[PDB]
From a paper:
Serine hydroxymethyltransferase (SHMT) reversibly interconverts serine and tetrahydrofolate (THF) into glycine and 5,10-methylene-THF (5,10-meTHF). Next, we have obtained high resolution crystal structures of AtSHMT2 complexed with MTX and PTX, as well as of AtSHMT4-MTX complex.
External PLP-Ser aldimine state (EA-type) is seen in chains B and C (PTX was not placed in chain A as suggested by poor Polder map coefficients). Internal aldimine + free serine state (IA-type) is present in chain D. In the EA-type of binding (Chain B), a direct H-bond binds exocyclic N2 of PTX to backbone O of Leu172. Water-mediated interactions involve each of the five heteroatoms in the P-moiety. Importantly, there is no π-stacking interaction involving PTX. Hydrophobic environment is ensured mostly by side chains of Leu172, Leu178, and Ile189 adjacent to PTX B-moiety. The carboxyl group (at Cα) forms a salt bridge with Nζ of Lys187. In the IA-pose (Chain D), PTX forms fewer H-bonds.
Residue numbers in the entry:
A (entry chain D): 38 to 517
B (entry chain C), C (entry chain B), D (entry chain A): 43 to 517
The structure:
Amino acid sequence: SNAEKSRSSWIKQLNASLDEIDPEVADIIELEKARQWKGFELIPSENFTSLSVMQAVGSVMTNKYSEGYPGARYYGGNEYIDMAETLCQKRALEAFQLDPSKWGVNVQSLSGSPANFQVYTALLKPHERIMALDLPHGGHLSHGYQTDTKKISAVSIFFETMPYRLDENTGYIDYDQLEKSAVLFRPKLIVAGASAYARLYDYARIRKVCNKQKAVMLADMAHISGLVAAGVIPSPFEYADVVTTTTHKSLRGPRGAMIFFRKGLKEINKQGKEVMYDYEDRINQAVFPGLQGGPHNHTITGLAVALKQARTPEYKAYQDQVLRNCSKFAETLLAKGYDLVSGGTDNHLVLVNLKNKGIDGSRVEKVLELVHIAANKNTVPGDVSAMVPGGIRMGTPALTSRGFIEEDFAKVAEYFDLAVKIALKIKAESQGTKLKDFVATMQSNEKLQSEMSKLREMVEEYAKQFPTIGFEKETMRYKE
Amino acid sequence: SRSSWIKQLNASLDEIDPEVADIIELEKARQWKGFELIPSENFTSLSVMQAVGSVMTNKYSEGYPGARYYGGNEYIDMAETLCQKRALEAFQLDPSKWGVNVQSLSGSPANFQVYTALLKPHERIMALDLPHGGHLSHGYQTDTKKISAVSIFFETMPYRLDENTGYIDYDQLEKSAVLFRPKLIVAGASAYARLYDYARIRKVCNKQKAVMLADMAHISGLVAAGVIPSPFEYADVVTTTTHKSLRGPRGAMIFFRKGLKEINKQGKEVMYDYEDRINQAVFPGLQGGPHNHTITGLAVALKQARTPEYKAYQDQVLRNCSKFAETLLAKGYDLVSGGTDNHLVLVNLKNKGIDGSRVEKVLELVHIAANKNTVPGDVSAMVPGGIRMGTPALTSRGFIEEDFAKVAEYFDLAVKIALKIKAESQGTKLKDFVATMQSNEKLQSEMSKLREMVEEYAKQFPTIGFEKETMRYKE
Amino acid sequence: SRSSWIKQLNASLDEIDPEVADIIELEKARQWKGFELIPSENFTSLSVMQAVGSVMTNKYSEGYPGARYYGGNEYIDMAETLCQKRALEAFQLDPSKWGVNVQSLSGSPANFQVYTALLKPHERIMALDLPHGGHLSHGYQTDTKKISAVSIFFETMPYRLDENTGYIDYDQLEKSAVLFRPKLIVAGASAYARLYDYARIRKVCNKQKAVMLADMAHISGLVAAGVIPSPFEYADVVTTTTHKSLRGPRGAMIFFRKGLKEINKQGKEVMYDYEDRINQAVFPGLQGGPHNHTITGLAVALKQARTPEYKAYQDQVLRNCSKFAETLLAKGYDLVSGGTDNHLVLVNLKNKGIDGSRVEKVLELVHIAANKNTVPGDVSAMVPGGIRMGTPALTSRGFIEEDFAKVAEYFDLAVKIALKIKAESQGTKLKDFVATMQSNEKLQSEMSKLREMVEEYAKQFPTIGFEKETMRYKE
Amino acid sequence: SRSSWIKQLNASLDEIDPEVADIIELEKARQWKGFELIPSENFTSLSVMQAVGSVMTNKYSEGYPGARYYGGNEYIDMAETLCQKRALEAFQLDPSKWGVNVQSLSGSPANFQVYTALLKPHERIMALDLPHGGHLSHGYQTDTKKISAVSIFFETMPYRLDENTGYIDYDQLEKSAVLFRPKLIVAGASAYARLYDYARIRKVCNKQKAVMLADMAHISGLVAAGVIPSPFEYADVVTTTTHKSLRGPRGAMIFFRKGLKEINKQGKEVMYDYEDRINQAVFPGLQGGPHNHTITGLAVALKQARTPEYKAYQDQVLRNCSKFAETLLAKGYDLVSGGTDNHLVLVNLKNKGIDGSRVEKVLELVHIAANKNTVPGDVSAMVPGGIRMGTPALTSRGFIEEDFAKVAEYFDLAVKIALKIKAESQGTKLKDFVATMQSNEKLQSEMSKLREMVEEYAKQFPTIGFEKETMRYKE
Ligand SMILES: Nc1nc(=O)c2c(CCc3ccc(C(=O)N[C@@H](CCC(=O)O)C(=O)O)cc3)c[nH]c2[nH]1
Ligand SMILES: Nc1nc(=O)c2c(CCc3ccc(C(=O)N[C@@H](CCC(=O)O)C(=O)O)cc3)c[nH]c2[nH]1
Ligand SMILES: Cc1ncc(COP(=O)(O)O)c(CN[C@@H](CO)C(=O)O)c1O
Ligand SMILES: Cc1ncc(COP(=O)(O)O)c(CN[C@@H](CO)C(=O)O)c1O
Ligand SMILES: Cc1ncc(COP(=O)(O)O)c(CN[C@@H](CO)C(=O)O)c1O
Ligand SMILES: *Cc1c(COP(=O)(O)O)cnc(C)c1O
């Protein structure tokens, strides 16, 4: 009686819906759905995943252990997991128009940050040297980072890192100083990859420095991979030895990562011997058995779906719109008196340098957040500290996914400008000059609270008009 | 164009990607019709999968609840904080003595994050030897190559079984540790059929002033249900995956002591110093944005782990494995350590005159999913002498003791077929075995008959996480 | 002003620096009047000292003979080439099978240079534990601190004595090495009274594919004379100091196999790969200009090592130590391993109720130079329980067997005084012992009488390296 | 057989080892007859050599004065304590602000001991690039190989000269240090002809919180005499050899700040933390028994460094080098940095159309001892484009300004012969140059004539450390 009652009970538990089993979690998800419906989402690393990707990520593919590689597994039962991973690899090469005799791919790395660590582990001995764009100048923690205080990224613990920096007069990477630094530092690997950079890489110049230094050229295209797949910006694959990327962000896939690497002939050396690329086995073995265990086959299957979408004409039109929206956004910001780092943009984001407006990014970000415009404060050339940012970073991928077009991003720039004006009013009313005096005014001044409520209402009414991505408005729990 | 990509983003998987949809339908049928005996596998709940497949995936939330780098994380914070508090409750932990990190992406990086938090590069780790039931994420090197990157960045040395008994040789562990001076000792295994002597590991770690890390990935659901002894009584740090016996999404958790540790010889309080180091190793040290969809599904799985029916499930996992072991022993099989006290068994096939690679090939063809596995005494990790099997996944579908007696019977029938294939093989090589297995009409018929028996038995049990009635492949 | 600084450059030490001249005269008297029993000390020849005190000191000669980075080295090349030739001849080595580096400045950096040549940073070394008779330059760390920098830059693990027998526990060494996987194993000691089983070390090194380094510093002169078995029969690399039983200047040599490997060890390379790596680690890796005054003095010492007189000397060293041990045993002293096969003994004072620190303080006051020394069983390495003594230095002055029986008698009388100071000591601590030792007039008189007995006995023997007749201090 | 080996031990070098005695006599004659221009060479005093060749060599004295690990060291303690006292006095150092270690065996291990004391393995060091005049013990690696072991165990990066001016580019050093974050910066060189901007290095070290290490090996005697500015005004740690301009024995010293460094923001004293770390790195970290004969000779040399005659000598060293540089420039040679402010010059032969290897071969044959040396602009490290020369050694023999004008003339005549050999060489490889140099009778006659000119000039000056009248080889 009790034994069978219990067995029926745990089977019911396993087959019941989330709404029935865990209403508290279901409610949180419904609140997050409403949040994604109502906001101006300008964080340039964020996007809205398709329903079909989410259905694959939420499938029974999660149940399987499949250590190894297709057709070379350690466990049985992997006939269909092998189909998915093989299909994912094939679509990954196709999405970037790569010759499979010249390029291989690993689709098992769990996210962007460990993907880079796996490349370093594959190709570098402990304490060998890496150069990458300095984090406050637009780099990423997974390329290394250390302050005067301590090593922040563990890449800087296990490997020896050194940054390269912007030309702070132009806002572009200072390639001349990168080259001169590399002569002295002797990197074994140079990363060409940025997060908060409004320009595209001079991959040809990085390639020249890497050739002279006999360094691996790693392109980390996480922020731009969807633009690359659509063919609307130049491809790092024209030059790089290894290419890493997140599968989320501009690719618009599940949370995950890919590692691409050259295969085949590198050069015939001076003795007439072929030198072959030595990346495939080293990288595949660093991922497994080196640093990961069982692949996440639900994510790999969702990635295959995302990579199919990436080849379509609709996806190319989407990425074209991302760029055109960002240019219109930049146009409108310039017309309204804002300064852009490097003077403009060539991609999906802008960096606004707020110095000429007489207020910093931390104050503006707080007002934007209260009116449901998501952006983030950003270091700009000229800041005295990497902890007091003078700028704001904003981008177009997420709202473009919901159907914002050029005229809509002109409106986004208008509402951003209205938020900046409120921030300046709060600063003017602030009894003091420190950020705590600013937030005290921002939370007690009823007149300025009312202006922010009004602007928040304007933001939400504009955003709500657009389709929701990945779920239906009609079945949302929270329709106000 | 605008309407064009909106439609693409909101279309079903069936509409957008029929090839992937069909692969998932084939995998559903595989999970329905087979004996899934890999002891690290389970069938997770529909509710977990609905959370993992939700829009929680869209948000970037680097940092920790209430201490994020980006805004817009109010509801992500609700989920992660709920997950953390449910994690401590699932193991009946006092939150003033234990903290938890729920962001680690899987079991292997979770262990690497602990080492990065607490050890400098090239500091010393001891753990169970991989061929004796350990795990790659604790270190492993051969005579010629460092296989796990743990053994590249840290200095590793194994401890071993008593090959006479199949239990860990704690006496030799203690003696080795005196000479090797580990800074951290791992108590955890992938292919060990017995309970750990955590008290003995604690004694060695105290003497060596080493961190005691319990890696409970395989047994975490048994621990949560309170049906085997808990490593939290003894350990400094506990890692676990969330997808094995815990029956959650693919992910991991890191638990650590916090608060007051002891009073020194001078009357001063000494506090634990794990929490900040581990949290910072996970982020910003080694990971970026948390996978909020997985964390949300983990919260769901942790609520399930508190229920009476979940405890009944884990008690059944244990009783099923005991019955499974008893039946295998009665049929003449040798088990490493002679039996089991948990969810798995390790069959040593050497006394039957055949190896694990050959038997596993037959199992695969009759729809029994297991893994060939090294046994103590194997001279090459490429020629495994054993098969590893366990009860979590089929117990989730409702297999009870008499059903696992049947599983042992069908395993034995598969071994008998493998022995016939070996006897008929025109050579001694694995490729000769495979050629016979694929060309011999009589033995192909026997395998087809056993496959039909396995599928007919498995099909009668409920499907977990999807509806049998709507499956594409119902035949 | 220029003729005067040239006068100061050519004047004698007596005229230029009477304070230093007086210090040397006091040290000459100390060497004349004492029982010098530290087994690593000797009295080198006048001819060695005249070469070390020559204008060979003025030359920079980085590189190797005939391959220098500076001009002017025609005669420095003759000296280094002659030194190398005599080094190989001193140990009866085939120059087609053995090479030598004579530039290493002393024993400790010589070993570090071998590790740097053959091991990557953090690779693994095994050697005899320091408290069991090993040496710091083979690695050493305590529970809390890495003491030798060898243990900072490389990963070290000790092997130990069998505490019951006092001999190296080779069985435990072999079992430990299986788990630890050393890349290099050191066979050599500072306070081991028995002969090494070099054949057994070779067997373990072969199984582990580890370099066998013999550090023969203490026994090199015995080896050169052929009176004990040679480590060159087995080792890959042999290091030594030149100032202990070899009786040369302060310095070191590194010997290494070269040429074709044994038939069963030839592979991708058929030749040994030690010579270039070791020579390059010495220079340009870790040293600069060779000390050609020392190298020239070493050439002199190596020629002396070939003579029948030198062989007779080393024979007497062994017979003196055997007699010394027998006399100590008959006077009730416990010896580690119960005796000796070489030039030293290690007295364990446990059966006497007093430690090495107390006894050595009395020895020093009665002009007997020895060292307190850890013994097996000591609970702490700061409180050594033994005294180490040996025969090389006094044998050089002509002490024979009956003279070392007298040395043992006077050692015994010193221990008895130490026991009286302990018995009269109020407190239990070493400060109270020293307080008694410096304030008790009766025991101060007994130490004075014993000091006179030691000095009267030692003064009868020839001085080595200088003449009694020109000593400043003749009383 | 006692009487036989005791006579062996007390006989003179002439009696025991005529071959070695002969080599030393040949080297004496070479030091009499040649132009010794290697700027790291000197001629030390007889009194130093008598101390280095004394019975102080016989003592083991591990530890520090008054803190030895065993007995017999009463007089060795006097010598080391006296040497420390004189070391601080020679550089006018306040003993409450500076300490010193006098046990480091030579300059290269002294620097390695400082790194081991103050830096963990793989921490970062900046120093002057070897091809720009730096030293191997500050680090050196090529694209293919780590040459100095400093670059194996630590992470090194060079700073460079302004190749237009030949002075250190301090602006680039500072900018490089921002990016590289060195933990230690070396201010010292082997072939830099200008004075260091120690104040600028101090400012960079302060901004980077890096240790400022001055390696003053080449200039130490100039510093002691007060004829150039002192690195002790700025540096945290100062290393030096003792055998170059200091004019002492072959050895080294490590100086370090001690005592109060600063008061922190809470009013608490902050002490320097160099002394214990450095002393413990020397022993027990990296060395064993001190070389007390060298330490005793060093004490002698340090007393000699205090005299007015010594100051007059170091002033003459500078004036001689200035005139030497002026004469080389007048004869058409290019100097790196266009001149000198210290004891050496570096000739860049590019404008003469010949490399340093060819020129040094002729110098050697005409008894001018110098070294081929890399210069800025050299494409290959193995094809040095320069010749390094300096004045300490011949100034010690009484050369004055007009004499170094003649040295420059004879160097010029040797270069002219080298150019003739090159012109007569049919091939362009160095072996063809050597073949021409050894077979051309006319050019051999010219080298023989120039050799006779060099010897006739050099022989007129006093010999340092020995008397001409007792030279075995006067012809
Ligand atoms: N118990 C157990 N756990 C496992 O995880 C496992 C695996 C998968 C992980 C694994 C992979 C490669 C090697 C490996 O050894 N690779 C070598 C092969 C050659 C050699 O073994 O010397 C290599 O050089 O790659 C060892 C282990 C195989 N057999 C296993 N058994
Ligand atoms: N056999 C033998 N060989 C030796 O060379 C030796 C020595 C001299 C070298 C030495 C110096 C310090 C420590 C040392 O350990 N220092 C510790 C303090 C002691 C401890 O912690 O146990 C430190 O912290 O410095 C250990 C060894 C003392 N006793 C010895 N015995
Ligand atoms: C103790 C332990 N710790 C960590 C892990 C790694 O988890 P991951 O596969 O999610 O990285 C495992 C996985 N173990 C799997 C894969 O080998 C198994 O089949 O046993 C484990 O057993
Ligand atoms: C085996 C061995 N190898 C190396 C050394 C180091 O020689 P060094 O003192 O010249 O550095 C020693 C010194 N041994 C001295 C100091 O401890 C002794 O009294 O025993 C040694 O015994
Ligand atoms: C600045 C500096 N520091 C250290 C050293 C090393 O001294 P050592 O040769 O005694 O090891 C040198 C040696 N310099 C010698 C050998 O290169 C020379 O001819 O210049 C040095 O120039
Ligand atoms: C976001 C990003 C990453 C890291 O991805 P995560 O999934 O957050 O670990 C790595 N590189 C770049 C350039 C990125 O923008």
